[PDB]
């Protein structure tokens, strides 16, 4: 029906229909009389997977013949979401499958809704891994995603009495048609044991064996016929394991627990052994595979044939593990193995928040990975020997830069290990990379300035434009053609349509259609009634103090209080939608969700308010909900305290999808404002420099409470039980934190935020000038393509050249 | 190549080849350059499964339309073995697949060896379930096998220093292409909780929920185009289960443990809660499914539409469960629900051994199934009220017949529950059924003589002749045609070829070919060197005292001692092969394996013996090893103490496959000897009556030790460490048991056994008269077809008529 979804040829459609009926019969063992929508989804999935197989085999073949340099993206998290629509988009089958399914009397969109999200990630970091895989396939890189096949991904969020409840995300229950088990590439991973020192070097003995069984998922490039591989490891007991008899068999579960469940902390370190086991497991199995592939072509050439990218410190053990294999198994000398390791490894840092930094107790590494701790100590000694020689007498530098932290419990600083063991260290936005060089890695920067790079984050315009917003894709494609989907900088051509009446009307119609569609999705799936003519004010992201959902809450209560004070005055109507999961043990995050829903319970049932103000908590925010709500959004809330959001990627998704941003000069907000122009961005609040000035002299929240009557009222309402009549003190922890222990200076930005939110409402009253500013945003969003990001990784870190040339079909 | 394996048409072969290449590509995602033999096996499996699908769908369809009476075979055990060859045989694809694979340059026999046994059973009982499914499909009955999909079947047996080691049978590791998950027919099973009594009857509340997820495996009939279903339940945690967060997700394993592992006890009861959970799990899920199917047609008609066969007491809870559903959920009155239950249920008893009888402690049923215990108590009261009225004043009868056993711990006699709650109770051989009426169920017989039946056991001549012994099948098919494969009584026509020289030469050539093939299989897979011209003396069955492997050991040592006494005298050379698994906690069974291997270590390395006597322990005896060794056997050892082997089925397999039987008048040995004639059977030892006479006056083993010099020598050799030089006392438990606590009277049968074994050697010296006696055995083996058994169940218990008429292809 729309051109960017591809051709529906007569043969193609006929062929899809007969393969759909073949799979319903032979694969699902159903006839049409007893098939459920879920059978129909599976038949279609199997039918689309069949178009991947030829390209997958030819691509892996082609990498064997050409033997290019291979990129290994190691991440504990791949936030993939659904695969079916994405596969159709990249193979150009979407219209043909729409037509084929329509003729069989099925609605393809209904079948798409039956696919489980692959929720093998928490948020920003995990989703960056997924966008990267898409861009590496699209840029024809010989790239492999390596991670863990968690049986349970990020938990399903139910709201119960306005409180978050967690349910196990049992995403594999009905089968995963996208994965292919490769039991024959099963590899042993070792744990515990002890080190014997012999004549012929150190030997790791009396270990417990867990098997790593790989599952391959295809990653299709955008219409280039390239299909790369995501390999995820599953933990499996060896068959001699524990082997009274019955318990031995049941205790196999202990070993398999390693790949059972994703840790649901976003920017929070928990030093749990099971987490360290997951980290070693993925590293040990992946490095054996990388080396096996390398030997099927002397380790001087290893870094010419292998790049390993570490997605944060989560796979930092890749550095000692590569040393251990090269020194203990391959018998290279220390210095040669170390050169190979540094030239192979590169480290992406994702946060500056201290509580997020991985600092593993030594006693844990001692018991679990005895040999790795020895190699870490040896790395530390040689590293501090170079610091001492470059900065003689600077003993405090030696303490600050040590991989080993002294204290009550000794800890390994995994970030320090990553910098020492990597030829390149990057942040994920220019301001973040600058903060790394000025503050937390200042000392490492001064020693090896050449290692520190910026690679500003990006999003795949395939999932985040073509797939979630076909109507916007199309009206863009009507004026400038299709080429921008793999070259997003071409969106700049839209600046010459900023005064075109037809284009202004088309941009605004698509937004209205997305809002109508989302408003309807709310009424069906969650019996809630929103005015589609309201401004859609949305904050969707994990629930964290630093992301200041609470600042948003303060604005919402301010709007409420202003309506009640002057009931009969015009206010631009808004639907305020906030959504995110809280980490299950993050008390404050769980209280913020409860406050959000408690504001809703007051605001949405006030007769005086009407449909002028609605507050909706969006339940179970995940990738597939982001594909629906982001295209429906008018205002993107990016309101982190300056210096806390390393980058953000939500900000980019919304910029691409025709929403204006209200945000701080934080993360990639800075580069977004610079691309669009500051006049096309609702910037407010402290800069990094202002927060620093507040810290030097001390943050007194009382000062703001005492000077801002509007803010005092909100705090009194919270305290006195205006929003919690049956439990008047329900929110004392929130009030108490905002008044005495606010690390994120919520009150400091309150006034500038509310004023800036008035400027938003004013622009929204003028639809034409709102839409023109939206066009200026979409048109300058090109930089924020993960294609640009990956091309920069490739040229400046991996040493490989991207390509948009097609493989043969 | 051979006619009973079907036609290899040009189109059929072309079509199989192109579907094999389609599956290698689309299903396995391999090209021919990287495929392993295991990929080739999977492609073939998928290719053969594709021929099942049409017939499976049409058959289940046809049962919906015709709505026949449905048979539900409830068993905790289905000993299926491999599915690939069996599927080819019953679909007539074997020659076509041989030809199709040959042209692709593969050997189908090599690919068959890659299939894992489905070892979801211990031995006789489990394998009877598998033969029954084959016969019910072949006789066109609307029959369903219902059991548990164990993640781990019967353990893999390694021999280490002559000792049994158990390894987990991880049979699902590479996938099972034969099963189809039906997640959409998932059902809740309840545990624990408590009973509330209301106005509207009793209510089972505050239960823990385990989900039962069914997997369907096709069961093809023999060339009738019928495909029945084996439905196996897998335990699955509900997604709210336990729902700090991480442990909650890991604790899901507790619920899923229910379907994790098969209990490896053959004829031994262990009162473990996990075993009771498995028993309720399969019963609760199966009865919900049976009732759902029944309501898709008032419970008066239930027994006209439903037969439930209980394979021993393992699913006895089906009786209280059916009462609980009918009374508590469907609101029938007690008496009407009870009539329905008795008319629906039938109980097959498999053993008289007291230690095998399921006697569940009340405290276990109290905690786990509170409501079932109440219904059991109510059944007991009404049952004993009928005993009291029929036998007034006989208070001892009341104690003996009670479902509730009094004592230290109160127990439920599950066998008593089965007799009370069933319209029919059968044994599994005529002598066994007679012993049930004279001894252990005498009282139940006197009350309800009409319930007690015999159904002599049988074996499927598809797996146990056509599949394992194609060369014997063929030479039979050359003279009398193919019709006998589904009508085994036609083998009687072979009695008119008992004096045909060509047929005598053909029977003997096939035996020699089977022996050459098996001798070679030993040399390859287990580096052992047997003379193929020796008599193949084989005892294969679970290791149990009652089966008297030890009697066999005594004969073997007797032959050894006789050779050493007269080195230079001729003895018929023998290969003595003994094989079986011991239950992991069965000390004595584990000692017997060690003795067997310890005799081997002495006998096989004695230069004076030569290749005149070899002793081989056959490692990992399972269905697929039975298919190899049984066709190679000359002498079948069936030497249980009279009254202990309820039936046996091995005995039948060997009779069918051209081996002569040395055995006691025990189990179906009696009916085999009566069919063939006693002169065509090596019968020895005590009858049932003689054992009874020995018991009355007392079994003194010393008496035999004192009168049989040959036996004294063996006992002295065992005691003094002749067979265990480094541990002289290794076998003191064996000697001590044979001398003071032999329940099975091994010495009582020793003399008559050795004499009878001399008669065997004498006949073997005359090949022509040996082969003529073999023909008399094969020719009278027809009764021992599971087709006869199932036709008798159908007409005399289930009330349905078998059919050999084809469904349309
Ligand atoms: O670069 C991609 C995005 O990364 C986000 C980030 N995620 C994380 C993150 C996630 C999961 C973890 C699990 C265990 C221990 C630490 C963890 C840290 C850190 S920083 C950052 O918070 C975002 O600013 C940024 O856009
Ligand atoms: O009828 C089929 C065969 O059944 C054999 C039998 N198996 C069993 C058997 C198996 C597994 C068990 C697991 C747990 C508790 C009790 C169990 C009993 C009993 S009797 C009998 O021992 C054989 O004689 C007979 O041929
Ligand atoms: C993009 C995305 C994120 C990251 O959003 P931020 O606003 O950068 O925190 C988190 N969750 C999901 C589901 C996403 O798609
Ligand atoms: C048939 C069979 C049995 C039963 O044999 P018996 O001699 O009756 O005990 C046990 N195990 C396997 C593998 C079988 O095929």
Swiss-Prot record, chains A, B:
InterPro entries (UniProt xref): Glycg_phsphrylas, Glyco_trans_35, Pyridoxal_P_attach_site
Q: Which GO terms describe its biological process?
A: glycogen catabolic process
Q: How is it modified after translation?
A: Phosphorylation of Ser-3 converts phosphorylase B (unphosphorylated) to phosphorylase A.
Q: Which terms in the GO cellular component ontology are assigned?
A: skeletal muscle myofibril
Q: What class of enzyme is it?
A: transferase
**Which keywords label this protein?**
Acetylation, Allosteric enzyme, Carbohydrate metabolism, Glycogen metabolism, Glycosyltransferase, Nucleotide-binding, Phosphoprotein, Pyridoxal phosphate, Transferase
The family database entries (Pfam families) matched by this protein are listed as:
Phosphorylase
Where Phosphotyrosine occurs along the chain? Answer: 192, 215, 445
Q: Which NCBIfam families match?
A: P_ylase
> Which family, according to the similarity comment?
Belongs to the glycogen phosphorylase family.
- Oligomer status and interactors: Homodimer. Homotetramer; to form the enzymatically active phosphorylase A.
Protein name, please?
A: Glycogen phosphorylase, muscle form
């Amino acid at each position: 029906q729309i051109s960017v979804r591809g051709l529906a040829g007569v043969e193609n459609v006929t062929e899809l229909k007969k393969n759909f009926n073949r799979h319903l019969h032979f694969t699902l063992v159903k006839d049409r009389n007893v098939a459920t929508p879920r059978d129909y989804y599976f038949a279609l999935a199997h039918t689309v997977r069949d178009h991947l197989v030829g390209r997958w085999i030819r691509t892996q073949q082609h990498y064997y013949e050409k033997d290019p340099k291979r990129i290994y993206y190691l991440s504990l998290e791949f936030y993939m979401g659904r695969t079916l629509q994405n596969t159709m988009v990249n193979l150009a089958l979407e219209n043909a499958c729409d037509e084929a399914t329509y003729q069989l009397g099925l609605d393809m969109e209904e079948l798409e809704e039956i696919e489980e999200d692959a929720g093998l990630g928490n948020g920003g970091l995990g989703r960056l891994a997924a966008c990267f895989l898409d861009s590496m396939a699209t840029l024809g890189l010989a790239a492999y995603g390596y991670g863990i096949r968690y049986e349970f991904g990020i938990f399903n969020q139910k709201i119960c009495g306005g409180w978050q409840m967690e349910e196990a995300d049992d995403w594999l229950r009905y089968g995963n048609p996208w994965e292919k088990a490769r039991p024959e590439f099963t590899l042993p991973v070792h744990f515990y044991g002890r080190v014997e020192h012999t004549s012929q070097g150190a030997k790791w003995v009396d270990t417990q064996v867990v098997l790593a069984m790989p599952y391959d998922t295809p990653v299709p490039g955008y219409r280039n016929n390239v299909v790369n591989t995501m390999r995820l490891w599953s933990a499996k007991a060896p068959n001699d394991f524990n082997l009274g008899y019955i318990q031995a068999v049941l205790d196999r579960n202990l070993a398999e627990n390693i790949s059972r469940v994703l840790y649901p902390n976003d920017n929070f370190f928990e030093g749990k052994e099971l987490r360290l086991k997951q980290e070693y497991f993925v590293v040990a199995a992946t490095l054996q595979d990388i080396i096996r592939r390398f030997k099927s072509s002397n380790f001087d050439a290893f870094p010419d044939k292998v790049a390993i990218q570490l997605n944060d410190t989560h796979p930092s053990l890749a550095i000692p593990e590569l040393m251990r294999v090269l020194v203990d198994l391959e018998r290279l000398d220390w210095d040669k193995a170390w050169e190979v390791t540094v030239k192979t490894c590169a480290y992406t840092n994702h946060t500056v928040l201290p509580e997020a930094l991985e600092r593993w107790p030594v006693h844990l590494l001692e018991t679990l990975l005895p040999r790795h701790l020895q190699i870490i100590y040896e790395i530390n000694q040689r590293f501090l020997n170079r610091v001492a020689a470059a900065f003689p007498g600077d003993v405090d530098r030696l303490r600050r830069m040590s991989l080993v932290e002294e204290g009550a419990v000794k800890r390994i600083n995994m970030a320090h290990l990553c910098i020492a063991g990597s030829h390149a260290v990057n942040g994920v936005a220019r301001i973040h990379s600058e903060i790394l060089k000025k503050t937390i890695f200042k000392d490492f920067y001064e020693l090896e300035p050449h290692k520190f790079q910026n690679k500003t984050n990006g999003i795949t315009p395939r999932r985040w434009l073509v797939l979630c917003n076909p109507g916007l894709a199309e009206i863009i494609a009507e004026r400038i053609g299709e080429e921008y989907i793999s070259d997003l900088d071409q969106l700049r051509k839209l600046l010459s349509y900023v005064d075109d009446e037809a284009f202004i009307r088309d941009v605004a119609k698509v937004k209205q259609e997305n809002k109508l569609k989302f408003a309807a999705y709310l009424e069906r799936e969650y019996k809630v009634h929103i005015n589609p003519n309201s401004l859609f004010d949305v904050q969707v992201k994990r629930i964290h103090e630093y992301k200041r959902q609470l600042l948003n809450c303060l604005h919402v209560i301010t709007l409420y209080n202003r309506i009640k004070k002057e009931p009969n005055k015009f206010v631009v109507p808004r639907t305020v939608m906030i959504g995110g999961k809280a980490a299950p043990g993050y008390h404050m995050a769980k209280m913020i969700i409860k406050l959000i829903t408690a504001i809703g319970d007051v605001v949405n049932h006030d007769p005086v308010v009407g449909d002028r103000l609605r507050v909706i908590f969006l339940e179970n925010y995940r990738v597939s909900l982001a594909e629906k709500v982001i295209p429906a959004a008018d205002l993107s809330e990016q309101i982190s305290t300056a210096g806390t959001e390393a980058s953000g990627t939500g900000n980019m998704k919304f910029m691409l999808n025709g929403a204006l941003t209200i945000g701080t000069m934080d993360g990639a907000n800075v580069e977004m404002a610079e691309e669009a122009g500051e006049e096309n961005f609702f910037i407010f609040g402290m800069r990094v420099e202002d927060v620093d000035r507040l810290d030097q002299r001390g943050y007194n929240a009382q000062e703001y409470y005492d000077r801002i009557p509007e803010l005092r009222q909100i705090i009194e309402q919270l305290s006195s039980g205006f929003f919690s009549p049956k439990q008047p003190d329900l929110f004392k922890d929130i009030v108490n934190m905002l008044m005495h222990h606010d690390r994120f200076k919520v009150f400091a930005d309150y006034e500038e935020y509310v004023k800036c939110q008035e400027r938003v409402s004013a622009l929204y009253k003028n639809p034409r000038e709102w839409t023109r500013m939206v066009i200026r945003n979409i048109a300058t969003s090109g930089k924020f393509s993960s294609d640009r990001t990956i091309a920069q990784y490739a040229r400046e870190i991996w040493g490989v050249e991207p390509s948009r040339q097609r493989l043969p079909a």
